Amino acid sequence: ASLTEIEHLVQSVCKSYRETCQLRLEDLLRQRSNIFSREEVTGYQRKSMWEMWERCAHHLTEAIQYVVEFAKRLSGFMELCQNDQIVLLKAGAMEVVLVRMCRAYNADNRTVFFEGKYGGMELFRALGCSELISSIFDFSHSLSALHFSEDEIALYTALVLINAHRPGLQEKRKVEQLQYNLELAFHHHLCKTHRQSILAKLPPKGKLRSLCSQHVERLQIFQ
Ligand SMILES: CC(=O)Nc1cc(-c2ccc(N(C)C(=O)c3c(F)cccc3Cl)c(N3C[C@H]4C[C@H]4C3)c2)n(C(C)C)n1
């Protein structure tokens, strides 16, 4: 599986990402100045956990939808069997959602974009999940320091999803072979862009898994 050919793989992945990222980077950057007032924040803090949750769960389900679209446009993903398609999405999707959040986060003032404006962690107080929210803000913050280009995220999240060590896989070797080509592609694009430095700054092995184990833990869905 050759080199001119991983060059096309890099371009292609980067395109799928761009075609499924839901909010454009430009808009997020532009809207940074648009912050929630002291009153608009109080409004959100007054609502019940249940209304926050509805709003949050709808935004998540749309985001997952986009992640699933992204996967479906990566080379070879659609050629894997259905059970394997599912096992990779079930295991990675919310991890990708989480990494995609860092583009909507603003290290200047510890704020994130949500429903048309930018807001600190206190916006989400009726959820009663200060610990979890707070550790999402910290992961988003130490990711914002890498100044991850859009293409690096696309390649990195392609590797979040395409992972042959997910328990449950049945054609492991065909996943391995997609994963390998994607790893080379990321490496090679880092070398083309002089950005090899970022490989050592990326989430320690398992930081993402365990933040997702913790996140998936709220099924407020049950009620
Ligand atoms: C336009 C818009 O608002 N989009 C939007 C909003 C959310 C969104 C949707 C849901 C969440 N929250 C709050 C949760 O994922 C969540 C929950 F629903 C229940 C308990 C704990 C958590 Cl973190 C958050 N958080 C978590 C952390 C406070 C920041 C932003 C963010 N998303 C995600 C798909 C990226 N996209």
From Swiss-Prot:
Expressed in which tissues: Isoform 1 is widely expressed in many tissues, including liver and adipose, and highly expressed in skeletal muscle. Isoform 2 is primarily expressed in immature thymocytes.
- Provide the function of this protein: Nuclear receptor that binds DNA as a monomer to ROR response elements (RORE) containing a single core motif half-site 5'-AGGTCA-3' preceded by a short A-T-rich sequence. Key regulator of cellular differentiation, immunity, peripheral circadian rhythm as well as lipid, steroid, xenobiotics and glucose metabolism. Considered to have intrinsic transcriptional activity, have some natural ligands like oxysterols that act as agonists (25-hydroxycholesterol) or inverse agonists (7-oxygenated sterols), enhancing or repressing the transcriptional activity, respectively.
Q: What is the effect of changing F114Q?
A: Completely abolishes transcriptional activity
Q: Which family does it belong to?
A: Belongs to the nuclear hormone receptor family. NR1 subfamily.
User: Subunit comment for this entry?
Assistant: Interacts (via AF-2 motif) with the coactivator NCOA2 (via LXXLL motif). Interacts with the corepressor NCOR1. Interacts with CRY1. Interacts (via AF-2 motif) with the coactivators NCOA1 and PPARGC1A (via LXXLL motif). Interacts (via AF-2 motif) with PROX1. Interacts with FOXP3. Interacts with NR0B2.
Q: What induces it?
A: Up-regulated in the state of obesity.
Subcellular location, in the record's words? Nucleus
Please tell me the disease that this Swiss-Prot or TrEMBL record associates with the protein.
Immunodeficiency 42: An autosomal recessive primary immunodeficiency characterized by increased susceptibility to concomitant candidiasis and mycobacteriosis. Candidiasis is characterized by persistent and/or recurrent infections of the skin, nails and mucous membranes caused by organisms of the genus Candida. Mycobacteriosis is characterized by infections caused by moderately virulent mycobacterial species, such as Bacillus Calmette-Guerin (BCG) vaccine, environmental non-tuberculous mycobacteria, and by the more virulent Mycobacterium tuberculosis.
Q: What does the record say mutating I133N does?
A: Nearly abolishes transcriptional activity
Which comment does the entry carry about domains?
Answer: The AF-2 (activation function-2) motif is required for recruiting coregulators containing LXXLL motifs such as NCOA1 and NCOA2.
Q: Which residues of the full-length protein are shown here? A: 265 to 487 of 518
The highest taxon in the source lineage is Eukaryota
Q: What is this protein called?
A: Nuclear receptor ROR-gamma
Residue ranges annotated for the NR LBD domain, each copy included:
5-223
